[model samples]
Target chain A: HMIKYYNINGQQVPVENATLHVSDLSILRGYGIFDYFLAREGHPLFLDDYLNRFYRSAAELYLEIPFDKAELRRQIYALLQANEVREAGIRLVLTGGYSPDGYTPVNPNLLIMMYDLPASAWEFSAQGIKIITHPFQRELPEVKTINYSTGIRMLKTIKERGATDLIYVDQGEWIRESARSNFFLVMPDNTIVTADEKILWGITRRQVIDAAREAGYAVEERRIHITELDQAREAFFTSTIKGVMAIGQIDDRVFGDGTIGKVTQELQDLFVGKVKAYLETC
Target chain B: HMIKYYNINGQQVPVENATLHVSDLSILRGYGIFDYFLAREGHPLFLDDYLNRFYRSAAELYLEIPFDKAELRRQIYALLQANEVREAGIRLVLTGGYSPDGYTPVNPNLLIMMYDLPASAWEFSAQGIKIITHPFQRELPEVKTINYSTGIRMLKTIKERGATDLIYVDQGEWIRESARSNFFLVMPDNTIVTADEKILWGITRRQVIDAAREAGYAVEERRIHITELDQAREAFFTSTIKGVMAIGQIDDRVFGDGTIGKVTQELQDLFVGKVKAYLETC
Candidate 1:
């Protein structure tokens, strides 16, 4: 769908005219963090949670965002109204600001843009996507900075492997999350485990853990090493847009039958219902 | 003096007007790399070297820059003339382009900005400055990506310590590079050592190393750990703006009477002379 309008700072303008300075820290240092939440029928979902995470990111970067929670909430809704999109994504960007030297943060640059949510990223297939693993580390992994330098560069290799997602391991050992998603696996005993630290905690992840527990499944959050790959009963990923994605193949290892596991299916169903309720009610 | 013009994809425009799309991947993913070089008398010093590294950075991020070297060089000259600034620093940026998904790279966006040199950054002051070390790692250390998230976040603590720069020691062990510059140390055996691997090779570092050889000092391009700090007769940093920064103090440790050593002085003088020759005659 063609976009008509987008927001910068708090002002809504024609999409074509929404621009940030080339000198802005977001561009100059590629140094900024952003948060995005889905909007349904022009209403934002879990915006408060997203904003809380956004504030955490800014704190990690020592970036002081100018707008308060209420101000940002008002502007996000304003952007949604002006954008006139029934189903879309609202992006809140906090940059390190424009720097003449290009290394230090001066004043953080705040930008907002609303865009139509892509159908591909929003939908999950019956046959889950294939995933590959690479050994790498993300600096300040706790913060959701825009630094996907390693992720994007691996696009060709991942695409060549016919893989839909990539996971990262540190020192060829512990399994980290994917470039933009969180990873989780189910043990033979029906216990769910995900990376406990050094990951961007997704709002969906929080709910998924809750949903799994409500489904009477045991959940464990810890450092998942690569050596434990074969012990998994099932594996999946979680993100804001992707929701919950099942992992069919990880490198040469495959989860039981490669189809969506029973627990995963229940959680996915539960997550979908929860999302609908939140979107419609909020 | 107030800044006037900058470049966005080779089109010189008002500095304030230099803007990028809010959806640009550079801002969304922090997925871009850049190269900077000093310009004097409307001429770019070591423009070829800078362009070479620029191409390298673009290649690392799989960013296929739209323009060629000669075209960029020509544009740089034009921008220099437009700004009418002599003895300034010029920055060339290549981004992963604008994408809706924030995960893929399309056609890369290119940006150039010329800023007047900050006198404080250029002027040699007080013989040297104190530096502190921290255990941290940078992703894509070879690529000059704008992911200085860790560096900028530590600004307050480092400044409060009265340190001019902070050096990163990987995992509390060997030295890497500083937040914004390359680090070097002189051994009691009169040999020069610096981390060769996993570092953003500075242009000034190359010249300084070459000058060390010209001054008849043995050079070892390898890791120098925290254990060797006390054994160092001298230590300094190299960067385009700082040139050669003698580290009079590293945390609580001092180097060679807490002043610049003779070999460091020789290399510093040599590097300065080399820079002057290139800048004035370029």
Candidate 2:
């Protein structure tokens, strides 16, 4: 279900009426940055964290979010309460405004939208999402901008391969990330490894990493090679909606026994607990 | 002044009211392809050429333009006729529609926007454009996707460096194209050099090449090394907007006597003649 109300430039506008001018840099040159978080029971979870990254993305692209960080945090809560959404996803986008030259940046517009997406409605499969690894790396990895053209163009081939996601690998064969999620490997030693830099620094990735450390697993934020996939007992992805879903297969290769590993299960539960902990605080 | 009408998916809508849903992939993921052409009176100059490349770009990104090529041509002409504008630039865009999942492509929306940009009103100088070269390459060189993020973000620094545009250079020190135009060098040997296969294949660049060949100048569509700047007699850029503008200077280096070359001057006139030929045929 969709919420009838949304926040456009700090105002509650009907979702149907929230439209961006065709002249906006976001539309004219596809220049924009956005970040998303989940809300539960009319409460935005880890909103501050999402906003921190949102502002960072804006800064990286030289897009100035008109509202200060504090104002944005307050606005997000206000939006959530206005919509009266019990369970949903909230997205905050900062677009390079209607540039006079069409290829330059100017005043940025903030587009905050909340949708009714219950936890149960979020996409997940116990069978795990099939993934195919391809050699690639996104531009401005640290900035979560709207330059997903490369990944989206690969959608047809991704669907044809019977895969729900794709893992981007560097020229060095190091696993970077999936289209929208971070890739992690469960080693035979029960330790976890994921690319440290050149990533979106996902909010869920932080929780999983924090949870794993609290559970006494050595988490190595380092480059994990694709050839090293054969050494992994399990693999999974971390994202806001997907949580800690396991990976069943990658291309023609399968992780040991092709099952979710014990480490992933432990972190998954602990990560949920972390979410619950934040939800209560909110 | 903005025209009163625009085209969206074959419908003529008020230009001031031309808007796209924030959920459109063009806004959500920066997932879209666009092509621009020059039009005079009600005639779309080289519309067929632009449309061919437009369709190719759409196919390159797995974006499906809802209308057939013939219908697209008809709609473009209809939009021009409806607007009744003279000497304006036409923009055609195809975006991945509102995807249920943010990273996938659905039915793509075709957006067409035009404005009153008289050819005489366009900016150009006999003194020409000042360009500075940067070491970089676009994600997908061939497809004219709307991922101008890199170039847009460098706007401040570009102006700071006293440059109008930046040319991309590969790691091999080979010169590539500029942000919105293609780069060319007139060698001391008088052979015109430009990057081939890895550039946008600008429509105006084609005219310059055809004009050069017809005028008995050898055009080398291959990589031009950055170091070759010292070996060049002159340099220039090509694009639909700029036509055949000479380079007043590049970085701290000046081309030849710091003025346009004989080849550039001749082709500039011949290019104008070619444009007249197209307009007459149209």
Candidate 3:
């Protein structure tokens, strides 16, 4: 629960005492944009990639970030150093700021907070988790906006059904991503498949795609049918904290003998190797 | 510029120091439920009506507020007393509290805040304020949830255009209400018209409707076409602070020689008379 926050000017402040107007939170109304990334050995892995996506999402929502990219980058680095954090997770939130008792803020506040990376987040990959399919669509799915009530509801639905996560389904189409992670699948033909629509272009997803290409495996981003879950020889999810995780099953549908498949295992290995190498070099 | 906030339990705190996590804002995103009312002479007018609508909206969003109707009523009275608010506007906000660090929060925090009413808010009825028609739609038009970005955006647009308020428009139809008020138009036959769809069922609007009914004036709540602006003999907006206000024009179109019509003037007088009599009894 430790936190270090920054205001619009990039000045660091105590998280608990930070001052933001009521109107700012009102503007959020659950549609704010945020991006989170993990750092290892004092260096945020793929920092540029995460920041680029954050900016893009903010632009889509017409949210004006207080600082430009260069300044933001500098501020993030300063925050990491200030916290004396060698391994941490950073949350960059850009909310529509406060106005005089109005919903549309004249200027929005930019909030950046960082915390230590929980060890359990990394341990889940080795011990694969189960997921359930949801029956609804993600509203405004393109932007990683703050509006995640649907996702939360789906999570409760999954938990009540005894599942680790929920994969959203809309009109019999498998949408990319879960409550938190991006989903991927490998067919019997050894081709990597992922849902292209209504899915976030996650940084880890990008990394895995690049790593798969480097490993000589073809990756295809397209719509996946809900019925195709039984046909997937291997499946996994990717995120800044989770990295790569093998999916044991989605609902009652099991993949590759109800365990981590060979392709998933190999990709997870490759992802870890790349992360370790990047951290060591930095 | 001063703000006073209270948590769900009605604890008073400085506005600048109030720290509600991002998770609470998700409640509105998930479900649309909220209640707001204005206080005058140390009392919130029509508090029961406001609370009923708030609870109804909350139910629509599938959120079960922690407090029951009686408990909430008691809490509101206690809060008003604690703040010593003699003449001010108070807002009560409830959200499904914080979700976890992931995309969705499991528990949502409820928030409440009070602020002094601006003096000009009460003067709009006598000295008409300018308004612009906004090109946007209020999602889930039936609920009064915390989702007010559209209203806020319209406010910004109004400010940018040098106006005090905005009337929402969707696909050439004038939706009811500004960011804070409900609109009404007087027809050539001395009948009152208001847009039924996509507008908040304002407490003040209800009172105005009641008063009109008692006075034997016909009131119609239906779709208001853009072309009907020229046919309106008079128009005005209703809210807690503004009470009742006559509109001079809409964009470039003037209604009934650009002067307040007979029906509007009558309603305004009736509204004032009711308020005066009610205050005397209280």
lDDT of 1: 0.82
Per-residue lDDT tens digits for candidate 2, residues A208-271, read 9999998888999997877888888889999988888889789887765566667777777888
Positional deviation of B53 in candidate 1, in angstroms?
0.8
Reference-based lDDT, residue B97, model 2 = 78
Clashing pairs in 1: A29-B146, A146-B29
List, residue by residue over B121-209, the lDDT tens digit for candidate 3. 64635445567787655655667766554554355557778777778776556666676689888888888898887788887888889
Under CAPRI classification, how is model 1 graded? Answer: high
What TM-score do all the candidates reach, one by one? 0.96, 0.95, 0.74
Per-residue lDDT tens digits for candidate 1, residues A70-96, read: 998888877766766778877788988
| Clash counts for the predictions, in order | 2, 0, 10
Model 2 regions lying over 4 Å from their true place: A118-126, B118-124
Tens digits of per-residue lDDT for model 1 on B1-282?
556898888798898788888778988888888888887666777777789999988887888988888888888888888887877888888888888576688788888887787575545443767889999878788888867777877888898988878889989898999878999988888899999988898888888888888778889998777898878888888888887778889899887666777777777679878877777766
Error of 1 at B185 (Å): 0.6
Question: Can you list the residue pairs that collide in candidate 2?
Answer: none
Q: Ten-residue segment with the worst summed lDDT in candidate 1 chain A?
A: A118-127
